[model samples]
Target: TIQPGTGYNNGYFYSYWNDGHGGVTYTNGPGGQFSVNWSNSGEFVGGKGWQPGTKNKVINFSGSYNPNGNSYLSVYGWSRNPLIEYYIVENFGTYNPSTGATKLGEVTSDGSVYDIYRTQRVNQPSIIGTATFYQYWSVRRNHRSSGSVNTANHFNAWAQQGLTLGTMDYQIVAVNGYFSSGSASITVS
Candidate 1:
């Protein structure tokens, strides 16, 4: 484990946050398989997918997920032009994600109901430096450790809420340890 650890491993991209004290260890197995063990903080978040990701794809992931604190298993990525951060959360830990965000609406997709939200992040860290941007969310009501995520359904739902995504970036099936300790072993494709 290392602070600010990032790059490609076993044909997949992996990364972690540098929160000073804690750290994350990433084990990139063959193909779309990987595992993460993060302690002390939310040090890790990454997975396998495409740059300039498409809106039309079914993200299938399966495995064991155990998050001691706040964490998220989702399709995480960003977009340009409009500069957006997005999440299609399939599962999460203790905290409820929709607590503070504006609840725009909801969409039922792939055998689950996801609540949509739109939020603003001003002067925050982004793909294109520190910039103000919007964040789109599709928080699943029922958590799943293994399932298929229909990307198009969530994307189109966001657009209907007047929340449009710009140029697609690296979209990956991610396990985000959001300010807590967690671990996951999965094969995502």
Candidate 2:
């Protein structure tokens, strides 16, 4: 079994066990924010929440490509603590396996391609500044027939690895397909 801890720091915090999932779980301390770096590349950070120092909402993970470099992942939430919520606001683009690079997944006015995941408050009390919650990004492996790649798949993978937090409890909520809430049970030993 793997147990992850929360703390205040500036660098990467790894989990005690690998989870055989090749991902790590993390949370911002009292006054810190979450940033991500993959294979020495830049990152897509999460957004801040409404509260000054308390986080009450959840953020979805997002990844983006650096037009000149590789793609990265990050979180967006309140700068203080007790995170309110987070989600994706910007998309750098999708990853291309052939070139090992990220291409335009979502077009920005600057002509850059980045993928995005957006989140809105389910409840109104937690709105401070508006932002999209995102965890990280991955190489674009799943492309839609519409020519634009599907970023949801990338989001789901990150969530499954526990790299991104979800509304569900300890275990990550599955993203590949829809599962009725309260369908699964947790068995503790």
Candidate 3:
């Protein structure tokens, strides 16, 4: 798991994919805060932020986003044992379209309502292996100041629908997009 102060100068966290033109820093904010700052056109940036041994517990966090331009704050994860990808995202500045993505349904868990979506990618290279895989998303349609998400229940709900999941290998909370006038700052606490 990444500590409160873990960070990156460029857009990279461990071996995760980060493509953008800016600088980001992870800092230790007050009150159990784990925050990130995007100095300029943050673009696409994210990585594994935590690893909870099994998908059987609650993952709680709260944060805020300040979008000087077009941006998105998202929580994403990958499961290796069964090769699945999942995400929860909140759009801020500009809307990034999910061209081929389909809305599966909506689910309420942990006092939050999420709009679920499913997408399929074939022959894509991943940490697990090169093969076809599915991506599931449980996104909040509206933005909030802070909240909690229970991943275990979400996975279980998806499993009931035939989308099998395995142990979570990694999870990430990221902000991506271009800041206004090539300058921006986002914080999560």
TM-score of each: 0.91, 0.22, 0.68
Q: 1-189 in candidate 3: lDDT tens per residue?
A: 123233442332322233444455544333334454555644444433455325664545555666666665666677876788777665455554354568777777766677777788799876667889888877776665356656676777777667777777656555555543222223322
Sorting all predicted structures by lDDT, with the top scorer first, yields: 1, 3, 2
Candidate 3 ranges beyond 4 A from true positions? 1-17, 23-32, 39-43, 47-49, 68-70, 90-93, 96-100, 122-125, 129-131, 176-189
Number of clashing residue pairs in every model? Answer: 0, 46, 0
Give the candidate number with the greatest TM-score. Answer: 1
Q: lDDT score, residue 27, model 3?
A: 48
Off by over 4 Å in 2: 1-4, 10-19, 23-85, 95-189
lDDT (Cα, tens digit) per residue for candidate 1, span 107-143? 9998889999988989988889999999999999888
Q: Write the per-residue lDDT of candidate 2 for residues 41-60, one digit (tens) a residue.
A: 22222222222222232323
TM-score of 1: 0.91
**Model 3 residue 7 distance off true place after TM-score fit, in angstroms:** 9.2
lDDT at residue 50 of model 1 (Cα atoms):
57
